DNA sequence: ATCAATATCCACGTGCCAGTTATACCAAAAGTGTATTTGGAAACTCCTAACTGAAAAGGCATGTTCACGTGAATTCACGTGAACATGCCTTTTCAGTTAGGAGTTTCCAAATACACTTTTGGTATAACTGGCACGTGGATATTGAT
DNA sequence: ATCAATATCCACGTGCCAGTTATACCAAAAGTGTATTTGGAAACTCCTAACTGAAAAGGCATGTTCACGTGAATTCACGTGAACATGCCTTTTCAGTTAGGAGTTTCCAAATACACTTTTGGTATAACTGGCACGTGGATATTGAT
């Protein structure tokens, strides 16, 4: 008598994936092993996400993520940077970047 | 003062705009070039908008509207909804 | 009377597994949220494509699993795949 | 007696403020007049969540933002420092929004 | 052993040209773009139908789904005319029965 | 006397083949009668406005043959069809000839 | 049994460059540009047959078709007509 | 007394040429050699049917000439006619495809 | 270089509100266990087309020479943006009306589901020919020297 | 301007093959008809949250001054185009070979379909506090004049 996320190891919500993918037209039918695996897909790119914008968090000497430790986490990776580069992360701001003949002197 | 919306996006706010972007000197005819590009910009996605809104049988553009519009012309939004 | 799902649950609980003094604001939530849809929906997506280019019915895991390698650059699809494939086996015998 | 500091100077600064703060640079309410007036001309008698323009002005700055981006690198391209409109127009046909 | 039936679009579009072009053939590989055609815009409408029916919690593609999707893929006067052309044949549909 | 539903439509594209891939597409899990019909029709204006344009290309260039360069020519001289098919390669149809004029001469 | 194959990014003659910038409409051409375009060539390829390939693997196949291209060249925002559905 | 035409009337002549036709311009079995070479390193053992190949070709050099506009453009905003490498970056630049 | 004006840190104090914590319903999932159905993996064998290899030719690639126009460097004039202090009106922040979003409910037109019948599209063979590709010479247009 | 060299346009005739045409075979869709189920348009009522209004807050418009970035002009070294000789390797057409794609059939592990049990995540109300925004002084850095 448990769930299939403690039975899988995860804390992401196998079963809601399961309906997910059913009530989304991807087909007739999902295997047993596909929300398993989709949810920890969703839950590994979460970690890794919340990892380095906590440090970012950090580096403001913050202690609460905010958006911008979201822009900057993804924008200073290069692999995340490419995931989402057609994506607008609202009340991000953009990274500090002044072209160098810019500057003075 | 009878003045144009379009115009209510001001020379100082467009000039913030280029600072965030990394500008360091505004031609004077940017400021019309911008409204411009701005107003096309509006229009498409609110176009698509209102479209998503009409089908629902709503009078009311929601912030999905908005989110869902936005993904279809390659500019998704995070942090309104979905 | 009126309910609405997010992953705000689940996504506190990986946050606090990953930085046990950190908290999260609001609108950080919200851009949690839309990631996760997002990335439900690419890879949903993208392995529903491939069972009806291959003929096939069922979105298996063999399905998520090419999804993640097109869908996601060199060293994080090796670190999903690994993740996923970790999720099932211990699914499986469990 | 009065201080001035030289052309470019004050602008390196603002650059620099710009960059580190996230906040809306549009005033709300000349926004929420354009949005209204912009959707009048599709559907009439409309309602705005309040959301809803919040939503389309982050998307709209970021579009500009990120626009500001590919023209400076077009004005630099071309030996210069300051933005033009053939930058701008330059950058909008490379990303294929015109021609 | 039959090879399996592989099907197109090729004896529609043949119509169509001999309507708009009644002494005008076709080559077989601009045929094969025209079968290209056909498909990639077959599933942009009913992709975006599929996500109209689901943004609004709705079961059922009909032909409102159908015209909403083609009002938001098509651009202006290409829209206009393929609303009527739709409109038209449902209905013309709906009262030859 | 049965007759398909595309002359029951006044269409010559096929709307029963078309239900069939809406409902082979996994889109939704119910099609309306009216769906197949109206994405018909979309279908083949489109493809009528194509054949016209790409039609007298064809005869421009004194053929009597469509060819993938006039299906080029008619979609890239269109605005709307541009618009629409701006993210497509036509496979053996070229590019518009188009020669910025500060490359020519005096 | 068959030859190894190595620097055939150098197949993609100065000649053949240059061809593809008159249909593009360039008029002078930096002695720079080629090797340039090969390394442009050659990251575009490697992308589609990453994905081609992909699509053949997925599919328990030996044999990359026309078809895996297309998916390929589709995902990526290249689609492509002539070729199958 | 030998005939010389001047440098540039050829070039023009070669661009109204390749302009005109719809062939592909890169030859066929160096072609095919170099996809090969890539798939290998990728995965062994593969075949390719005649059609991929070609469908790959056609992919390539549409996409090159494509990127020969755009990094046309960027030479003549720079007040030149010569396209050099800095041109072709900013052209991927701007498109996306490097940024 | 010596200054002074202004911007920028830094370390610290402040109150407030959005976040964390907890609790109680509770319906709506999610799970469990059963009966039941089926997709597609597995055998096998058919057969397409990918690969290999020969061999000849000529269409291009290569590398060289040579001239010259292009890009780059430098100078200079002038006009246009940047900086700034000013005068103040527009946006921002608050209140109490309702529009209409969203829930709930009924029930009919409209969808799915079965079996059975009809025909239409695709394959294939044989057949066929006219459209186009190719080659020629010949009158016309264009380019570069002068 | 005249001129000549060269490319280009166009009509011409050629063989050939891809396109067109027409035969039959036929399985696989499509159409028709029946009984069955259901999604969701329609009433209505509820209750947010979008709108209006008014009063306060601070950003913007304006005009002046001039630093200096831009575009125009002019030089020039040399990289790039044009032309040409050389010959190599692509291209072309045929052949034989078998890998592996694809078609068929069997049948079982894993899917869905219920009904039923169990609990989880969402809501709500009340409470709570510390994280963060914001204001402070005062020490330093920056900047621009001299
Ligand atoms: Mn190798
Ligand atoms: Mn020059
Ligand atoms: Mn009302
Ligand atoms: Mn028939
Ligand atoms: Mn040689
Ligand atoms: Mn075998
Ligand atoms: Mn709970």
């Known amino acids: 008598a448990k769930t299939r996320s403690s039975r899988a190891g995860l804390q992401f919500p196998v079963g809601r994936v399961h309906r997910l993918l059913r009530k989304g037209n ?14 920890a897909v969703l839950e590994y790119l979460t970690a890794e996400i919340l990892e380095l914008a906590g440090n970012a968090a950090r580096d403001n000497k913050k202690t609460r993520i905010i958006p911008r430790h979201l822009q900057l986490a993804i924008r ?3 692999e995340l940077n490419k995931l989402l580069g057609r994506v607008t992360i609202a009340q991000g701001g953009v990274l500090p970047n002044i072209q160098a003949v810019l500057l003075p002197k | 003062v009878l003045r144009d919306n379009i115009q209510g996006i001001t020379k100082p706010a467009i000039r913030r705009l280029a600072r ?10 940017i400021y019309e070039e911008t409204r411009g590009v701005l107003k096309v910009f509006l229009e498409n996605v609110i176009r698509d908008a209102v479209t998503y809104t009409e089908h629902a049988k709503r009078k009311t553009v929601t912030a999905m509207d908005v989110v869902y519009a936005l993904k279809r012309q390659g500019r998704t939004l995070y942090g309104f909804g979905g | ?3 609405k799902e997010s992953y705000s649950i689940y996504v506190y609980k990986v946050l606090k597994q990953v930085h046990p003094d950190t908290g999260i604001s609001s609108k950080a939530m919200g851009i949690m949220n839309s990631f996760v849809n997002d990335i439900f929906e690419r890879i949903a ?13 069922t979105i298996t895991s063999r399905e998520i699993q090419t999804a993640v390698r097109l869908l996601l650059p060199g060293e994080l ?3 999903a795949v690994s993740e996923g494939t970790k999720a099932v086996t211990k699914y499986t015998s469990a | 007696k009065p201080h001035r500091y030289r052309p470019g100077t004050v602008a390196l600064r ?4 710009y960059q580190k703060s996230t906040e809306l640079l549009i005033r709300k309410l000349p926004f929420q007049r354009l949005v209204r007036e912009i959707a009048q001309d599709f559907k009439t008698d409309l309602r705005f969540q309040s959301s809803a323009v919040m939503a389309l002005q982050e998307a709209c700055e970021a579009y500009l933002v990120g626009l500001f981006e590919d023209t400076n690198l077009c004005a630099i391209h071309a030996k210069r420092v300051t933005i ?12 294929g929004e015109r021609a």
């Open chain 1, 76 to 78: 200073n990776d290069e």
């Open chain 3, 77 to 79: 699809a090796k670190h």
């Open chain 3, 1 to 3: 009377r009126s309910r």
């Open chain 4, 84 to 95: 033009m409109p053939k930058d701008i127009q330059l950058a909008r046909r490379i990303r």
């Open chain 1, 26 to 39: 991807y087909s007739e039918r999902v295997g047993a092993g596909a929300p398993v695996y989709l949810a």
């Open chain 3, 45 to 57: 997506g993208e392995a529903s494509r491939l069972a009806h280019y291959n003929k096939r019915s």
């Open chain 2, 20 to 29: 965030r972007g990394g500008v360091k000197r505004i031609s004077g005819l």
């Open chain 4, 14 to 17: 603002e650059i620099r403020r």
